[PDB]
Amino acid sequence: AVADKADNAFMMICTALVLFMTIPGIALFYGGLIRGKNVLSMLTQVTVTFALVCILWVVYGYSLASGEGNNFFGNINWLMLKNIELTAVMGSIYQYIHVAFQGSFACITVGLIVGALAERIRFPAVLIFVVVWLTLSYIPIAHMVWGGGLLASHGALDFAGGTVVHINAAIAGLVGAYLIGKRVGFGKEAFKPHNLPMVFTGTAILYIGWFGFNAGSAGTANEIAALAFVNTVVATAAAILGWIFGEWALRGLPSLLGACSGAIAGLVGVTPACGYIGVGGALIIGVVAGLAGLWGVTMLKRLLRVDDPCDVFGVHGVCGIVGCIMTGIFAASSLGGVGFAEGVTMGHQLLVQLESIAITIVWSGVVAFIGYKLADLTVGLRV
Amino acid sequence: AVADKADNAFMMICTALVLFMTIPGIALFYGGLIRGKNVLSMLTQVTVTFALVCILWVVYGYSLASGEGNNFFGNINWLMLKNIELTAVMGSIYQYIHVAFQGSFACITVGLIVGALAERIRFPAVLIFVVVWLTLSYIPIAHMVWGGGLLASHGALDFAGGTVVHINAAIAGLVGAYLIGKRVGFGKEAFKPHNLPMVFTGTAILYIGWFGFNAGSAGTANEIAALAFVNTVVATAAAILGWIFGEWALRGLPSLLGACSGAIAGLVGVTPACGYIGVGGALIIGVVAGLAGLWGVTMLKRLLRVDDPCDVFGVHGVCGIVGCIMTGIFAASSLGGVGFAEGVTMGHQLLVQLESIAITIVWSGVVAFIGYKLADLTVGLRV
Amino acid sequence: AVADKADNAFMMICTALVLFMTIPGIALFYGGLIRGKNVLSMLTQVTVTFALVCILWVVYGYSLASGEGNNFFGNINWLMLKNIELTAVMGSIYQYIHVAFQGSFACITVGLIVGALAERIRFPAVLIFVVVWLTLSYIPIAHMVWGGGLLASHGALDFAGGTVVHINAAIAGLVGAYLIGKRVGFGKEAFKPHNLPMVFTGTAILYIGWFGFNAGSAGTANEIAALAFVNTVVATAAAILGWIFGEWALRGLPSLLGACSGAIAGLVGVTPACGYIGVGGALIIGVVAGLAGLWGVTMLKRLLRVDDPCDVFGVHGVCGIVGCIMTGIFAASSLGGVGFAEGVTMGHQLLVQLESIAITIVWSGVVAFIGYKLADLTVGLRV
């Protein structure tokens, strides 16, 4: 087709915003959650795995994720972007922009995992994990949801990655936390308050970059991007208030960490729904995502019993799940949503949402397990 | 009408930039000005009130600020954005983008106040204040200036919010500082130098986001946005140099805080003028705003006698006032400006500018007072 | 001509991104490399010289850099932007946007120098240096490369400033480090690890802003901007891995500083090549730039023998040189590049690249020397 310069402009900036989410967004976020002694190692691992993902994406990730193929993966006709004319158009933008935008999603997904596990995993081991998990979990899932694969064929609703990014990463991260133990030093049982401003800063950057993430998923600076933008604002705000409210009634006082976690919970929750729901649905998904996130990290604390950066997966996993399910409800026009596909009823959509969640959790869990084992058996996992 | 995708793209990014100003811009700015013990509380309050404002804005703020009504407020036909088709166009962009862009302005305005007072006001009290002040001061004033209200009917020139945002917030903030006392610990009489890099970082983020703030106010990626962009660069630079020069001749040495305050002074000063003046006028308003800001904080120091985050209101108020008045002068074509409205002479424009300033100061001062009293009488103000 | 709003939108945001690179990008970058005692002074100098450059740019920098004239400089027909209608179009955007975009390049270039030397040079002395060097080195070189000057007439390939920005600044910076000594306190021989997160944050911001820097140099949100965007991602990633690999085999372990330096090396390296090469060429230039950068700082360490912010010039200079030369190779279509100009062979292009490098190094070195001497003779250099 023909590229619309406005969309090209919008999508390259949105891509920049998404990249901003990982570098330095996620890094600053986790930087404030981990003990100073491991921050440098974590930043190094986030930076290098980010670089690794960028390369793997252009080499074959894009071709296998977005190339046409079967229900689980594409092809290798676009290795190193071969056979893609610079003027090739995907949707209403130059395919090259589509490559970068999609590549940035792969980056933040990996960032979510590495940023949390970096401190407990050997450097070479994380590299092996990234290669395996990106290649066998992210790419297939990305293809299944956005590459016209399985989940897409079933009509799974996931505007910006509730499954591909959040649930996908949350599971890979939780398995990592399960397989790799971590020694909590004395006095380091709770997140250091003095470092919370960095968590806030990371949260803020993720929030800002998330607009490129959510609105950019419209693929064009149109009314759907506008809707996604507004829902992102509302859902995030709603989740902050919801989490803070739940925390207020649960602890008698709100906390900075709670407010930030709430922001993330709403961002994760609205991710799959932003372009399919109305502002009213965004507010509701936001409040629920915030309360669900609080519930989620509270449960993780019962297991870990200590503040751990991996608590982040509790928010991404739970809110990712909540948002994905809620999308199946609020996508309805009766609720101000965009509507379901042909012959689709809310009941059927919910089931498809559950299937997507189910498949993502299992697929990512298995691939991650394999990834961690391969790393362990080769160079050794735990530091 | 029909939405121009280029403008949609421009305005959603500008909205992201403005949101960036509050989260984390203003938070980092104040974070570096307040004692470490209250930073966490301040960040929490900024985050939650930001969330609160985002919600109140979509629920009724937008409808009452931009809906058509009388000279002080709009209507409630757009509660929760009801009756607004996704494809509805406002100007040359989708109305939904207009909602978010305008909502982000409400957010930074509230951020300016809360970021400075957070450390001295009870959490629940700030929430009550925000609701009251946003609803009764920001919304009406926004409607009066940008919603076709009173000030707009009189031809008040305020491109991006010299009154709606800066003077409005400056007054609400100063009243707060007047009503709510603060105990200055020993050794905490001056801003901690070690924390100045965060003030610089906050300033930098405000500066960058300010381009979306000023240029985005053009409502379109046109020559007016270009002008506003260039004037923002120039006025900011001019104010930095002006403040630094004034500080150099007043103290024998420039300071980081002075350079940052200068940047803000120029940003505030050019805010109402950016799209109506020439680059020459921007440079002049910048130098004057910088010197006026220095004068302003110097006077506040004579009253407070101690470094206080509320000194920020001195810059916003004074430079806001200076910029608003200067707009009435440099908008003239003889001075390279865009020109005055029909039958308008510089003398008449100045008077209208003064009236807008006068009305904003009194309206905001009264509403803020009421807001603080209501909060005090209900849950208690001072921590 | 007629302005394309999409391009106007793209270019104003790209300009914002480039400005973001200096404020706070470069400031945070250097902030983490210099001892806390001089950070405040450095931030102040970066902020003020940034302001100074913004002003000098609008006053005469733009007219002399982009105005039509001879092979070394333009004219003064655009002083203070006089004679430039607001609706004047340059390329496909409003000239005013072109002014700001180009002005932001001048800002980051000066930022690269001041951020590194600030701690060792007197405040008034840096101001004098900036005026002299910006006026006599940056402007002429900018005119020579982008103002249709000498290097442009010879067909020098430099998409975003390998010479104008990086080599230009690297030389001016190295001369400064050569002329101005610095006392290294005991225990301050190596960069403080505790401050590395700020270097990472600065690097991240430079990286994100660099997209506006590289892609924006296309002057339009077209396929060339898309290519530049993708190459920036790839080259940066490749350089991170290359540097990290070289560091791993050279020291047995990667470091955060190495990963960040690698990012910069790739960004600098691809700068002149991004819009002329293929993704394959970007990856190769990236790996080479990363290894070359490591080699470069390693050599500087042999001379300085201590960690010094000026080591940054080693990366910009070397990678700038490497990227400029490599552009002459990978611009070839056989290599997936865009192709050489008329009657141009790779061999001839390489020579022209070398000439541009040669001329830039000498021109900047001489002007900087003069600048530092004038400053020294007038107010004194070293603090």
DSSP for C147-212, please give it.
SS-HHHHTT---SS-IIIIIIHHHHHHHHHHHHS-----TT-SS--GGGHHHHHHHHHHHHHHHHH
* CA torsion, ordered B143, B149, B155, B156, to nearest 10 deg: -40
The span from the CA of B121 to the CA of B127, in Å, is: 10
Q: Which helix (H) or strand (E) holds C313?
A: helix C312-330
> Which of C76, C72, C75 minimizes the C-alpha distance to C144?
C72
CB atoms within 10 A of CB A2: 7
Contact between C116 and C317 under an 8 Å Cβ cutoff? The reply is: no
**Which residues fall within 8 angstroms of residue A314, CB to CB, at 6 or more apart?**
A170, A293, A296, A297, A299, A300
Task: Show me where chain C is broken: residue before each gap, C-N > 2.5 A.
Answer: none
The answer to whether C23 contacts B207, with C-beta atoms less than 8 Å apart, is yes
In angstroms, the CA C253 to CA C244 distance is 8
The annotated binding site of C for NH4(+) is made up of 217
d(CA A29, CA A176): 19
Residues in A closer than 8 angstroms to C206, CB to CB, are: none
Cβ atoms of B263 and B203 closer than 8 Å: yes
- Residue ranges of alpha helices (H) inside chain A are 5-20, 27-31, 36-56, 62-66, 95-117, 123-133, 139-146, 150-153, 168-179, 196-215, 223-251, 256-270, 279-304, 312-330, 346-378
The residues, any chain, with a CB within 8 Å of residue B21's CB and separated by 6 or more, are B104, B108, B111, B205, B206, B209, B210, B213
Signed CA dihedral, A191, A197, A201, A204: sign only: positive
Name residues whose C-beta falls within 8 Å of residue B331's C-beta, 6 or more positions apart in sequence: B157, B273, B276, B277, B337, B338, B339, B340, B349
| C51 contact residues in B (CB cutoff 8 A) | 236-238, 240-241, 244, 259, 262-263
Both structure tokens of A179: 């397989």
**CB nearest to C58's CB, from B10, B203, B234:** B234
- DSSP-assigned beta bridge partners for residue A382: A121
Give backbone dihedrals phi and psi of B371, rounded to 5 degrees, phi first. Answer: -55, -45
Residues 6+ apart with CB under 8 A from B250: B294, B298
Rounded Cα–Cα distance for residues A265 and A166 (Å): 10
Could you give the residue ranges of the DSSP H alpha helices within chain B? 5-20, 27-31, 36-56, 62-66, 95-117, 123-133, 139-146, 150-153, 168-179, 196-215, 223-251, 256-270, 279-304, 312-330, 346-378
Contacts of A241 (CB under 8 A, 6+ apart): A262, A286, A287, A290, B48, B51, B52, B55
The whole-angstrom distance between A140's CA and the closest CA on chain C is: 22
> Partners for A (CB, 8 Å, 3+ pairs)?
B, C
CA–chain centroid gap for B43, Å, is: 19
The one-character DSSP state at B277 is S
Per-residue tokens: B51 = 């969330």
Rounded distance between C-alpha atoms, residue A319 and residue A310, angstroms = 15
Determine if residue B334 is labeled as part of a ligand binding site. Answer: no
For A164, residues 6+ apart whose C-beta sits below 8 A from its C-beta are: A105, A109, A138, A141, A142, A145, A146, A158, A360
Contact A119, C248 (CB under 8 A): no
Q: Are A258 and A294 in contact (CB under 8 A)?
A: yes
Residue where the block lists tokens 């062979």: C345
Q: What's the CA gap between A337 and A80, in Å, rounded?
A: 39
Token pair recorded at residue B70: 């009388």
Q: How far apart are CA C137 and CA B135, in angstroms?
A: 54
Mutation pick from C17, C240, C287, C330 vs chain A, by most beta carbons of A within 10 Å, is C240
Cα of B168 to nearest chain C Cα, Å: 27
The CA dihedral of A29, A30, A34, A39, to the nearest 10 degrees, is -100
Query: What tokens were used for B40?
Result: 């966490």
Q: How far apart are CA A253 and CA A236, in angstroms?
A: 20
Match 């009194």 to its residue by tokens: B362
Residue A371 in tokens: 């990834």
For residue A89, which phi and psi values (nearest 5 degrees)? -110, 135
Are residues C9 and B7, on separate chains, in Cβ contact within 8 Å?
Answer: yes
Phi, psi (deg, nearest 5) at residue A99? -60, -50
What are the phi and psi torsion angles at A93 (to 5°)?
-130, 165
What is the β-pairing status of strands B89-90 and A89-90?
unpaired
Q: How many CA atoms lie less than 13 Å away from A41 in the CB half-sphere?
A: 17
CA dist C267 to A269, B265, C159, C199, C215, Å?
Answer: 35, 34, 12, 16, 12
DSSP state of B166: I
Instruction: Give SS3 for C13.
Output: helix
Q: Minimal CA–CA distance to C321: which of C154, C174, C117, C103?
A: C174
Residues of A in contact with C7 (CB under 8 A): 5, 9
- Alpha carbons B151 and B356: distance in angstroms, whole number: 6
| Cα atoms in the 13 Å half-sphere on the side-chain side of A90 | 24
Resolution in A: 2.0
Conformation bin of residue C88: beta by default, left when phi > 0, alpha when psi is -120 to 50? beta
Contact yes or no for C280 and A87 at CB 8 A: no
Residue A370's alpha-carbon distances to A170, B33, C228, in angstroms, are 16, 49, 37
Q: What count of Cα atoms within 13 Å lies in the side-chain half-sphere of residue C72?
A: 7
- Inter-chain contact B97–A200, Cβ cutoff 8 Å? no
Q: What is the DSSP letter of A217?
A: G
DSSP C81-102: GTT--TT-EETTEEHHHHHHHH
Give me the residues of B, 35-54, that contact A with CB < 8 A. 36, 39-41, 43-44, 47-48, 50-54
Interface check for A153 against chain C (CB to CB < 8 A): the answer is no
Q: Do C24 and B205 touch (CB under 8 A)?
A: yes
Contact B44 A254 (CB under 8 A): yes
| Residues facing residue B121 across a β-bridge | B382
Closest by CA to C197, choosing from A198, B244, B382, is A198
For residue A382, the 8-state DSSP code is B
Q: How far, in Å, CA of B167 to CA of B151, rounded?
A: 14
At B53, which CATH number? 1.10.3430.10
With tokens 């031809």, the residue in question is B155
Torsion of CA C192, C198, C201, C205, to 10 degrees: -110
d(CA B24, nearest CA chain A) in Å: 5
Return all residues near A375 (Cβ < 8 A) that are at least 6 apart.
A121, A122, A124, A125, A126, A128, A129, A132, A381
For chain A, say whether C254 makes contact (Cβ under 8 Å).
yes
Residue among B267, B268, B270, B243 nearest B257 (CA) = B243
Pair C133, C375: CB distance under 8 Å: no
Q: How far is C144 from C137, CA to CA, in rounded Å? A: 10
Distance of alpha carbon C205 from alpha carbon C196, whole angstroms:
14
Contact flag C54-B233 (C-beta cutoff 8 Å) = yes
Give the whole-angstrom CA distance, residue B168 versus residue B365: 8
CA distance B255 to chain C (A): 6
Q: Which of A15, A51, A99 sits opposite C240 (nearest CB)?
A: A51
B/e letters for A173-210, b = 16+ CB within 10 Å, e = fewer, are bbbbbebbebeeeeeeeebbeeebbbbbbbbbbbbbbb
By residue range, what is the domain housing residue C37? 1-383
CA distance B235 to chain C (A): 9
C221 interfaces chain A, CB cutoff of 8 Å: yes
- Max alpha carbon distance in chain A (Å)? 61
Token duo for residue C188? 């301050």
Q: Which residue of C has its CA nearest to B244?
A: C48
Contacts of B86 in chain A (CB under 8 A): 223-224, 226-227
CB A266 within 8 A of CB A290: yes
Count of domains in chain B? 1
Per the document, the length of chain C is 383
| C237 contacts on A by Cβ (under 8 Å) | 50-55
Task: Give A216 to chain B, closest Cα distance, Å.
Answer: 10
**Residue owning tokens 């403005």:** B18
Q: Does B324 touch chain C (CB under 8 A)?
A: no
Structure token pair of residue B82 = 């009801």
Residues 6+ apart with CB under 8 A from A162: A268, A269, A271, A272, A273, A320, A323, A324, A327
| C240 lies within 8 A of chain A by CB | yes
- Residues from chain C that touch B13, judged by Cβ atoms under 8 A, are 9, 13
Tokens of residue A181, six digits: 């133990």
Which residues lie below 8 Å from residue B243, measured CB to CB, with a gap of 6+?
A: B258, B259, B261, B262, B265, B290, B291, B293, B294
Residue with tokens 């709603």: A238
C52 interaction partners in chain B (CB closer than 8 Å): 237, 241
The number of beta carbons lying within 10 Å of the beta carbon of residue C377 is 10
**In contact, C219 and C11? CB cutoff 8 Å:** yes
